[PDB]
């Protein structure tokens, strides 16, 4: 399973490099990252999991850059999503970058894949990182619904 | 490149085998079969391309089996649409088996992927095999519209 995850991520990287505008490489990366998750993370009071939040400075850098997105930025957001599986805000940014680069079909696939994931594991919508920041903000939640 | 196609197919096969209810492996197979087609086949009179139609006995076998669909049937249909990339009727049948076996998300994904391919190459809607049978039957066409 660990090696399979790696095989899927390498194949996804190759698909994405070759055709940034094609959805399937992006979908395969989501499967690689998420398919192994069958139980939601344990949590204490307030549904706070003992998992580190994304660095808010790292997140502010990506936010800043959305005024002029490029592949470099998009790659960093994607890499962050692969390292931080519950950072759902990253999928919203990623789809926003896709949309701004003219990759409509990829933006849509990114929304759908997060929707599918959350349909399988709905309890994830209620959980937070160790600092009380939500996996899924009310903004990301509304974005997904829309 | 050939080895890339084969790599994609093997990954796709293993994703489908492990999780037959999960869309992404089916999607990966489509990309493998179709991504290298940027031009539609040449044709002569009657929009007949010089490509062999699917064996009618083979198709009669799959249709008869739709009475009691199983994994074996589904695999054969899938193998056939891998070997015969323009046999769109086979996607309809695949999605019908998916539906019947309770895999609705997969059925939907099969429809989406074919509509996507047809959006990229719309002249494929007007072509036929060497005996005049259409790449896209009116039945397949109606299924996509639904």
Residue numbers in the entry:
A (entry chain C), B (entry chain D): 231 to 376
From the primary publication:
The structure of an Ah TssA2A Nt2 domain construct (D231-L374) was solved to 1.76 Å with four subunits (chains A–D) in the asymmetric unit arranged as two independent dimers, consistent with previous SEC analysis, that showed that Ah TssA2A Nt2 exists as dimers in solution. Each monomer folds into a cluster of seven α-helices (α1–α7), the arrangement of which is very similar to that of the EAEC TssA2B Nt2 domain (RMSD = 2.0 Å) as determined by structural alignment. Specifically, the related regions include helices α1-α5 of Bc TssA1B Sd1 (i.e. most of the ImpA_N region) and α2–α6 of Ah TssA2A Nt2. This similarity suggests that an ancient gene duplication event may have played a role in the evolution of the Nt1 and Nt2 domains of TssA2 subunits. Following refinement, these dimers could be seen to be essentially identical in structure to that of the dimer formed by the isolated TssA2A Nt2 domain (RMSD = 0.4 Å).
